[PDB]
UniProtKB/Swiss-Prot annotation, chains A, C:
Keywords: Isopeptide bond, Lipid droplet, Phosphoprotein, Ubl conjugation
Gene name per UniProt: PIL1
Name of the protein in question: Sphingolipid long chain base-responsive protein PIL1
Gene Ontology molecular functions: lipid binding
Span covered, complete protein: 137 to 204 of 339
One GO CC term on file: mitochondrial outer membrane
Native source organism of the sequence: Saccharomyces cerevisiae (strain ATCC 204508 / S288c) (Baker's yeast)
Amino acid sequence: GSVQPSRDRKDKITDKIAYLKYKDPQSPKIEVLEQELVRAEAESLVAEAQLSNITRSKLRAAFNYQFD
Amino acid sequence: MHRTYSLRNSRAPTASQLQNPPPPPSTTKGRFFGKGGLAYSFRRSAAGAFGPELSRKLSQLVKIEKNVLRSMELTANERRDAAKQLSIWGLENDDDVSDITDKLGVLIYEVSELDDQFIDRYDQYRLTLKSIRDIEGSVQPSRDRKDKITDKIAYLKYKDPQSPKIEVLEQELVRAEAESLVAEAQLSNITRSKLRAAFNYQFDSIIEHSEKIALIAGYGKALLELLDDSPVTPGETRPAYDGYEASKQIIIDAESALNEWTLDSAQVKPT
Amino acid sequence: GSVQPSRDRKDKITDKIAYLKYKDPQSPKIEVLEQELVRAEAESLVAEAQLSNITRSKLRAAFNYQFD
Ligand SMILES: O=P(O)(O)O[C@@H]1[C@H](O)[C@H](O)[C@@H](OP(=O)(O)O)[C@H](OP(=O)(O)O)[C@H]1O
């Protein structure tokens, strides 16, 4: 639940970039938005890994304890 | 630098001062500023207390640059209209005066034309600085969020160490740190480039405008050198003035020199 | 005056393509619209040439006649 908002924000930034590119290509906000998008992508790249690292361990430990 | 190297607010003697004594200060310098009412002050103050704290100063600088650029347009318009008025006034006089005055008005008329291009380049430089302002203002919230997360972790650790929110908060903190590590680099990468480019453009524009103005003034002096003067006794009649052709050649040469000049052919060579 | 509507239609088609790409990339109308755009471009390529061919001739002839 804590992990999800990062991907939410990345999707929002991507949608904003896609809309603003269509509206007018001459806006000066393309570069800053692209930099923000690449920053969010770099963050999510490690966020997904740290989310997927612990699930397969905690689930296994809990189920082993329950079965014992 | 008279102010820096001496506590006096006056002007230290120099070569120009030694050659010619400095003129008295202008009498039409009133105590009241009269800086276009309170609109300038409002534009100056409102911009510095609304947006993010990081980009507060650059907005003020942009507004002040806008005021600077705005003033020169009025100056150029007034100078052009002054030239027009002088040309109008010179008509009802002698033949030589009715021509020299018109030629001088025509020559003076191009200062506003140069100032318009200077203003355009100034606006370009202002936009270039505004880009840096915008990117730094967008950069700040990431560090704001990282600081907030760090403070939350520090408080929750003190409140009770047995809370299960330590691990998730620590992971969020490390994620924010990893994001800020590239955010700071991408913020610092472009400032030293955009500032350098904008200032180089501004200096090139200043050099070009100053050299063109100096050339125009020199050719104006050359044209005015033709105006012959001699005292006349009462009852005498001055000889008919015949110098129409020379002035036309002078102004044609001025046009040719102004058009031919390029940046690479700058006459001034700094040491 | 007769030449202008071709470029008007080409601009309209380009704007429609640009908007529909932003709205959703999964629409099946991208290919047909792109083909229509390339057809309009091929038409305008000769329309501009045939417009510019005759102006410099008719203007010159008319002005020569007037001066004579
Ligand atoms: O003392 P005041 O009320 O402010 O008026 C000034 C001065 O007393 C004269 O009236 C005038 O010089 P002239 O009589 O020669 O025109 C001058 O105009 P100027 O500043 O344009 O020279 C005024 O600024």
